[PDB]
mmCIF file with all atom_site columns, C-alpha atoms and ligand atoms in Angstrom:
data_model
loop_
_atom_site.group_PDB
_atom_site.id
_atom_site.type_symbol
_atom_site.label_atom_id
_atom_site.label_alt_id
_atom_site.label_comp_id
_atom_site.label_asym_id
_atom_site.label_entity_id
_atom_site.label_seq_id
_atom_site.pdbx_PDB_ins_code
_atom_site.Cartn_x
_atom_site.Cartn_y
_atom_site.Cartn_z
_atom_site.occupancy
_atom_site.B_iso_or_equiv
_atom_site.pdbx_formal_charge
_atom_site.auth_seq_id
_atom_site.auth_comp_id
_atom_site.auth_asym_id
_atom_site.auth_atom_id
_atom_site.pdbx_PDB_model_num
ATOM   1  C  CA  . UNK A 1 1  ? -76.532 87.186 78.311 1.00 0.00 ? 846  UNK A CA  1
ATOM   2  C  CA  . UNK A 1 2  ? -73.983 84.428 78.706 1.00 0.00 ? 847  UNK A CA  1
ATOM   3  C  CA  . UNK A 1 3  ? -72.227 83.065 75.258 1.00 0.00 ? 848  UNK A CA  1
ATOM   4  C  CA  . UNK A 1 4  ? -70.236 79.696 75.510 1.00 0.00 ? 849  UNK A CA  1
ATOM   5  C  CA  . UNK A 1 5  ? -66.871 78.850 73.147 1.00 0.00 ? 850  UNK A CA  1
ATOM   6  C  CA  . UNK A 1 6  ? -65.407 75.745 72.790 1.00 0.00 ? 851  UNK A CA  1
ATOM   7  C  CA  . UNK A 1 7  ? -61.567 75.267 73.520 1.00 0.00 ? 852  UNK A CA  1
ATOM   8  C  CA  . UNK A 1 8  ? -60.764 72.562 70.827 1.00 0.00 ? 853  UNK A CA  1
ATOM   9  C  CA  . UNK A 1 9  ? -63.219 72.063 68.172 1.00 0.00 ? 854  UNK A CA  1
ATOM   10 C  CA  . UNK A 1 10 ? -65.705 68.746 67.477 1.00 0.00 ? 855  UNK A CA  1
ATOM   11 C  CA  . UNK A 1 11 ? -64.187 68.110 64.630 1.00 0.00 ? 856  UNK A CA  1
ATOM   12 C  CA  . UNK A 1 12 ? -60.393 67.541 66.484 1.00 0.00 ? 857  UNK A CA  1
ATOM   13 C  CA  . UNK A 1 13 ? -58.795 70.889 65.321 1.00 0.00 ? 858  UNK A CA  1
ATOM   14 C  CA  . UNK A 1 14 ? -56.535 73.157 67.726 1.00 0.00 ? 859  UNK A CA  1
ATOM   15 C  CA  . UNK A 1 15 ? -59.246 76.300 67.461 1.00 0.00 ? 860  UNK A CA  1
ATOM   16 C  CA  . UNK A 1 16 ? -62.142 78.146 69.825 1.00 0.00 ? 861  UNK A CA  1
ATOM   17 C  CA  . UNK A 1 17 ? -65.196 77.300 68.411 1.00 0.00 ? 862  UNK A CA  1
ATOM   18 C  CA  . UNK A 1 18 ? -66.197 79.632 67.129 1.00 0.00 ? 863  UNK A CA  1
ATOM   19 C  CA  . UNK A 1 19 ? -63.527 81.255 66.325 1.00 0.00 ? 864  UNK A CA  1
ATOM   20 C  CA  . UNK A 1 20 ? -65.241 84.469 66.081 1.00 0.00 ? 865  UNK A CA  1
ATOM   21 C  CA  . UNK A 1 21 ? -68.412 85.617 67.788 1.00 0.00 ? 866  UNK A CA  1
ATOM   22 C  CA  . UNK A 1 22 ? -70.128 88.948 68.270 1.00 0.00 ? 867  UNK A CA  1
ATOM   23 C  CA  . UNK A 1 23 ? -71.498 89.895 71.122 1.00 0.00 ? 868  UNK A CA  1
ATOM   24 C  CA  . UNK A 1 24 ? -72.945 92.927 73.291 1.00 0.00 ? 869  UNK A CA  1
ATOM   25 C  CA  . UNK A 1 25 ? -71.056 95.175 75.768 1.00 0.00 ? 870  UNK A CA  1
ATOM   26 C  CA  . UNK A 1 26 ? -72.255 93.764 79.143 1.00 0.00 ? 871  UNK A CA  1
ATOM   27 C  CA  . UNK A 1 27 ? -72.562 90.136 77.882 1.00 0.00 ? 872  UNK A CA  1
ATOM   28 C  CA  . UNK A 1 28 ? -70.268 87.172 79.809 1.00 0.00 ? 873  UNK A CA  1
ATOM   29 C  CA  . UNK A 1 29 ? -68.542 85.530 77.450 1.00 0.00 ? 874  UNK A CA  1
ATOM   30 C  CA  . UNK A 1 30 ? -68.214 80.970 78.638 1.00 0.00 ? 875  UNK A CA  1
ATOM   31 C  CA  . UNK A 1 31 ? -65.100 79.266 77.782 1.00 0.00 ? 876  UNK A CA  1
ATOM   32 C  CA  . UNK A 1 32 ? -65.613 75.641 77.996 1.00 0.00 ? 877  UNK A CA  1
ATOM   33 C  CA  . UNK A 1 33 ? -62.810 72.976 77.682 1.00 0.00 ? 878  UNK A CA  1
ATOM   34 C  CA  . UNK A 1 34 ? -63.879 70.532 75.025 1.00 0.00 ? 879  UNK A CA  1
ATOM   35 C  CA  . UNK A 1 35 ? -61.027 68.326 73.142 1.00 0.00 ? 880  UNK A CA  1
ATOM   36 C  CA  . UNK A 1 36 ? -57.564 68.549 73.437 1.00 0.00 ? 881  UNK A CA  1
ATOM   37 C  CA  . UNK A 1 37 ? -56.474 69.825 76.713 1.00 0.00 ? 882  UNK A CA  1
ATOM   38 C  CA  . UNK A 1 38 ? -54.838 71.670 78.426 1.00 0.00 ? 883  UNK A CA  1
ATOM   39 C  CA  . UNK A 1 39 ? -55.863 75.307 77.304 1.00 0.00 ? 884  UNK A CA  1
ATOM   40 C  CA  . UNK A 1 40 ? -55.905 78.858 78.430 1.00 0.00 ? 885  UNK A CA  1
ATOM   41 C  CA  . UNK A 1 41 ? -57.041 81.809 77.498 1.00 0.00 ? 886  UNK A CA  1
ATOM   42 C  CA  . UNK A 1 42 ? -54.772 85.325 77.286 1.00 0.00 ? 887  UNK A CA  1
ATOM   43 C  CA  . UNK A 1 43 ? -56.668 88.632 76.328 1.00 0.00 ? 888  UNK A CA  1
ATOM   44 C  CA  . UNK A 1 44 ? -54.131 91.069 74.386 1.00 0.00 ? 889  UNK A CA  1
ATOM   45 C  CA  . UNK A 1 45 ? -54.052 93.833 76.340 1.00 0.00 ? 890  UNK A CA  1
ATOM   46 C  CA  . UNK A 1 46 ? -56.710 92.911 79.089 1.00 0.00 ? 891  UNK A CA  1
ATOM   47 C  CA  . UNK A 1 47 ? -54.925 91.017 82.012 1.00 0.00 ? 892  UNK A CA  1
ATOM   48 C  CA  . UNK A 1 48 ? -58.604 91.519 83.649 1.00 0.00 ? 893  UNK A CA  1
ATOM   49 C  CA  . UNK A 1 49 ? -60.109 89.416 81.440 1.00 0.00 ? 894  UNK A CA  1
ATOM   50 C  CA  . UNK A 1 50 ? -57.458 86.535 80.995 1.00 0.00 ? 895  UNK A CA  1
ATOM   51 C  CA  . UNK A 1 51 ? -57.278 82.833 82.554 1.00 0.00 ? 896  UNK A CA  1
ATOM   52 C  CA  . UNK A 1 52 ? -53.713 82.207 82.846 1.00 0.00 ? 897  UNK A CA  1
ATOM   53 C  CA  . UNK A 1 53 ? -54.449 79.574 84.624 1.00 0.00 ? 898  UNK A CA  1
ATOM   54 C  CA  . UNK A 1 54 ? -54.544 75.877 83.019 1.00 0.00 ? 899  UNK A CA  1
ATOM   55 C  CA  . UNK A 1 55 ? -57.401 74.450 82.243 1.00 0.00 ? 900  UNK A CA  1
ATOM   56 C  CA  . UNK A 1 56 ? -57.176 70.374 82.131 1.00 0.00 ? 901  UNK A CA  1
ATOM   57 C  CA  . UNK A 1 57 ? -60.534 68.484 82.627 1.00 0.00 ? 902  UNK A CA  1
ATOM   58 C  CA  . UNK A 1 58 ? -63.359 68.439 80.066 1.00 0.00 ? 903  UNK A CA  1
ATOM   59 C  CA  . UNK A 1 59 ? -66.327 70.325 80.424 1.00 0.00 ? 904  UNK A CA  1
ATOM   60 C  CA  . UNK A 1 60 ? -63.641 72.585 82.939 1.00 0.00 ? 905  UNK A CA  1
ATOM   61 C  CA  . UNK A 1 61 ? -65.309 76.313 82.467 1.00 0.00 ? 906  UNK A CA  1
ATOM   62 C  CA  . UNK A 1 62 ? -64.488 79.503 83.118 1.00 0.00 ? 907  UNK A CA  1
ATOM   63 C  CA  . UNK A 1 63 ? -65.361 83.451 82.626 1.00 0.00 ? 908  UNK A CA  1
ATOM   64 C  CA  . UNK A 1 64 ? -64.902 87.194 81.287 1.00 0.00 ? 909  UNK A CA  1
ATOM   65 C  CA  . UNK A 1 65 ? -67.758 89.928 80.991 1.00 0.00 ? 910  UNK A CA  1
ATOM   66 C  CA  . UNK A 1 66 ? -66.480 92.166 78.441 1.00 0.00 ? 911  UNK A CA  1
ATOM   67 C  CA  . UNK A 1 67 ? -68.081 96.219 79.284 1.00 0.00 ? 912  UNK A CA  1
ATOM   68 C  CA  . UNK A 1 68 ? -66.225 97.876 76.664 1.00 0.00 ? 913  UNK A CA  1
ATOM   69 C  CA  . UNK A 1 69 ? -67.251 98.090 72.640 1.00 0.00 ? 914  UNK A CA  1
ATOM   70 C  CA  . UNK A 1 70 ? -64.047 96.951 70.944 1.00 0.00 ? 915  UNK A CA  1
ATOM   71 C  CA  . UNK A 1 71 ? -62.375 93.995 69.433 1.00 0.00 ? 916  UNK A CA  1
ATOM   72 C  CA  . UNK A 1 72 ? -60.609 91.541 71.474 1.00 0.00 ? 917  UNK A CA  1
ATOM   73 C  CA  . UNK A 1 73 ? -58.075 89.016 70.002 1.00 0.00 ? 918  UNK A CA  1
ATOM   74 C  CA  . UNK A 1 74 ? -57.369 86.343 72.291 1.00 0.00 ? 919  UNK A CA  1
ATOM   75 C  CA  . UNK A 1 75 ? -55.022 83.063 72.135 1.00 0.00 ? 920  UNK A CA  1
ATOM   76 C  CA  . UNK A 1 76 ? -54.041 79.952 74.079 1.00 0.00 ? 921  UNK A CA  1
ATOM   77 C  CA  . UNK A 1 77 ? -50.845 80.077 75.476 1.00 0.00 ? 922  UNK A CA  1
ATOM   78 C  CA  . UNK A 1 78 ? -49.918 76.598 74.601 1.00 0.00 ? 923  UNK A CA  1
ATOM   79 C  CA  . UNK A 1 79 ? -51.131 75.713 71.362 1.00 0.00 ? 924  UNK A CA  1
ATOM   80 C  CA  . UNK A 1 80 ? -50.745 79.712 69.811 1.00 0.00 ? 925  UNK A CA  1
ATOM   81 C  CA  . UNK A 1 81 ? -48.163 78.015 67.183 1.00 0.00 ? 926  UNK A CA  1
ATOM   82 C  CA  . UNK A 1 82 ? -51.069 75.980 66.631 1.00 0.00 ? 927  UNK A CA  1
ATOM   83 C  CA  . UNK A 1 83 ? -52.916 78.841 65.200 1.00 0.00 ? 928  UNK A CA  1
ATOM   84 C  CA  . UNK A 1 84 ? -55.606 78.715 68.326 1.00 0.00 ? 929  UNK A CA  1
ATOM   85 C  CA  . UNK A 1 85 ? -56.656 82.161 68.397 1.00 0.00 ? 930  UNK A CA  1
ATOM   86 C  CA  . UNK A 1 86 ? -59.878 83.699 68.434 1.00 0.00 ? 931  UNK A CA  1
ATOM   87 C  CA  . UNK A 1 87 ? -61.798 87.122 68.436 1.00 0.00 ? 932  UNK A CA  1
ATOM   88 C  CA  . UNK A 1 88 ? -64.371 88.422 70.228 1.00 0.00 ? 933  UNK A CA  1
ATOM   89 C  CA  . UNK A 1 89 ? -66.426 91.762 68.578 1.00 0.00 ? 934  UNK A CA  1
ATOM   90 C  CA  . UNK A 1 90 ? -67.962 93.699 71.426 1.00 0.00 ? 935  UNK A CA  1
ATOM   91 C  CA  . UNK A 1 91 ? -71.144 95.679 69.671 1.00 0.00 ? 936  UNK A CA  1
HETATM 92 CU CU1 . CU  B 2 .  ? -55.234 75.422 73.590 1.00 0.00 ? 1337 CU  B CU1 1
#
């Protein structure tokens, strides 16, 4: 299945929304640029699974299918100071 996360949250805050989410080894995991731009999205550890890349328009989305069981912590480049980090459990 296909999950979606927020990159800035409704309520204004520098965060992925949610912050943490569970999902299954196979799933796609949907970031989706939603307040606050620009944000990216760096994978510790998985260079596969990062968007270096910018992203600057709302609604702006992009992808990862996580395979392996693990936890992921993951972190936008730009507002990281910010405290806009995130984790994804892979069950
Ligand atoms: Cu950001």
């Amino acid at each position: 299945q296909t999950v979606a996360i927020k990159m800035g949250a409704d309520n204004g805050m520098l965060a992925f929304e949610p912050s943490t989410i569970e999902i299954q080894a196979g799933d796609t995991v949907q970031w989706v640029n939603n307040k606050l731009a620009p944000h990216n999205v760096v994978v510790e550890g998985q260079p596969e699974l990062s968007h270096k890349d910018l992203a600057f328009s709302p609604g702006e989305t992009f992808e990862a299918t996580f395979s392996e069981p693990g936890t992921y912590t993951y972190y936008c480049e730009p507002h990281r100071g910010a405290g806009m980090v995130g984790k994804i459990v892979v069950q």
